[PDB]
Every structure is written in C-alpha cells, then in structure tokens.
Amino acid sequence: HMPGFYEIVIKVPSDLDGHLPGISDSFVNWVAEKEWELPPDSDMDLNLIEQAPLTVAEKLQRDFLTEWRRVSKAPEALFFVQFEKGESYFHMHVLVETTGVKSMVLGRFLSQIREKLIQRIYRGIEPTLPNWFAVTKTGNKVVDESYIPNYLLPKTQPELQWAWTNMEQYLSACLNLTERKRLVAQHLTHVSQTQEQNKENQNPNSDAP
Numbered sequence: 468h469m470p471g472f473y474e475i476v477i478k479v480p481s482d483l484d485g486h487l488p489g490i491s492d493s494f495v496n497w498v499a500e501k502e503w504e505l506p507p508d509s510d511m512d513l514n515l516i517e518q519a520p521l522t523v524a525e526k527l528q529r530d531f532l533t534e535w536r537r538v539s540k541a542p543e544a545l546f547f548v549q550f551e552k553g554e555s556y557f558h559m560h561v562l563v564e565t566t567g568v569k570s571m572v573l574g575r576f577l578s579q580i581r582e583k584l585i586q587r588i589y590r591g592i593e594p595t596l597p598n599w600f601a602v603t604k605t606g607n608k609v610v611d612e613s614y615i616p617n618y619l620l621p622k623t624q625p626e627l628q629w630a631w632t633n634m635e636q637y638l639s640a641c642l643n644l645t646e647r648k649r650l651v652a653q654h655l656t657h658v659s660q661t662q663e664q665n666k667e668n669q670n671p672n673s674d675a676p
C-alpha cells in the first residue's frame with residue numbers, strides 16, 4: 468500500500484547579497500549564468516520561471532534526497548518535490564516517504580541533513596532566510612499521497628516554478644499543466660464518488676472514525 472510522507476518546506480535564496488552575503492564567486496557564476504530549458508513534453512512558460520533560484524533549488528532538492536536516502540537506508544524512496552514562488556520567498560515543498568525514518572528520530576536526522584546542505588551548497592554560510600528549513604508539524608505530520616493532487620498539483624505559473632518526482636504517476640505532471648489539471652479532476656472525481664458511496668452505504672459498522 469502507498470505510504471505516508473513527511474513534508475519539509477525549504478526556503479530558497481533568491482537574492483545573492485541579501486540571502487547569501489559573501490558567497491563565493493563560483494556560486495555567483497553558477498547561479499548567474501546557468502541556463503534552463505523546459506523539456507519537449509512540457510507546456511509551461513519558461514519566461515515565468517526564475518532560473519537562478521531554480522538553479523539553487525535543484526541542488527537543494529538533489530542533495531536533500533541524497534542525504535535522505537543515506538539516513539533512511541531507503542535508496543529508491545518515493546518523493547515529490549515542488550518549487551514555488553511564494554508571497555515572500557521562493558520555497559520548495561519536499562514530500563518524501565516516511566519509510567526508514569521513524570517520526571521519533573526525524574528531527575535529529577533532518578538537522579544532520581540541514582548541516583550537510585549548509586556545508587555542501589552554501590559553503591558554511593547560514594543563509595539569511597527566516598525558518599528556511601522546516602518540517603510540517605501538527606508532532607511530525609504524516610500526509611498521504613493525496614496531498615500532492617490536493618495542494619501541489621493545482622498550482623499554476625508563476626506560483627508553480629518547477630517539480631521533481633520519482634513517483635511514476637506524477638512524472639508527466641511535473642512540468643505539464645494540462646496533465647496536472649487532469650490528475651486533480653481525476654482525484655477529485657474519486658473523492659466525490661467515495662463520499663457518495665459513504666452516504667449510500669447500508670452496511671454494518673458504517674461508523675465514521
């Protein structure tokens with residue numbers, strides 16, 4: 468059966484001097500000059516995708532999942548990562564399956580992952596961003612797969628910037644708005660029909676938990 472996911476919201480630096488003051492020139496070159504292009508199957512508008520924060524965001528997600536895999540001992544663990552342009556900050560919603568990391572040790576593991584990112588990406592610089600590495604709480608919150616079509620998939624540009632997944636049902640949806648639209652409607656249709664079945668059900672122990 469499909470597992471539960473932890474959510475880690477990571478704020479992404481989108482302004483060099485204000486968020487990463489004194490960061491090395493090689494970081495500066497990397498972020499300033501790296502080009503992005505949408506895949507052939509994408510229907511998104513590249514003109515709305517901020518590439519420099521995207522460049523950092525890609526490495527953050529990349530390095531997080533590497534460290535998550537090590538720490539969880541789950542090499543092909545399921546994830547859905549979505550890069551957003553929020554009201555105040557660019558941020559990533561990192562959904563990763565709970566497998567291998569019991570809730571009790573999640574926080575300690577995340578701190579280990581947090582220091583790795585600081586060391587590997589920001590060269591020791593603590594980024595000047597408020598609460599930039601936070602796990603969603605209620606204790607540690609566990610969402611099921613439904614969080615993706617409910618809250619992440621319906622996002623459009625420019626709020627939606629980019630997305631990564633190893634989850635096979637969301638591959639084409641990552642950078643295709645039409646596919647996202649289809650999956651949201653499909654999920655909501657299933658939810659609606661599930662609601663209807665509940666009302667119409669005449670079987671014993673129909674006691675709402």
Ligand SMILES: [Mg+2]
Binds near residue numbers: 551553
């Ligand atoms: Mg958001």
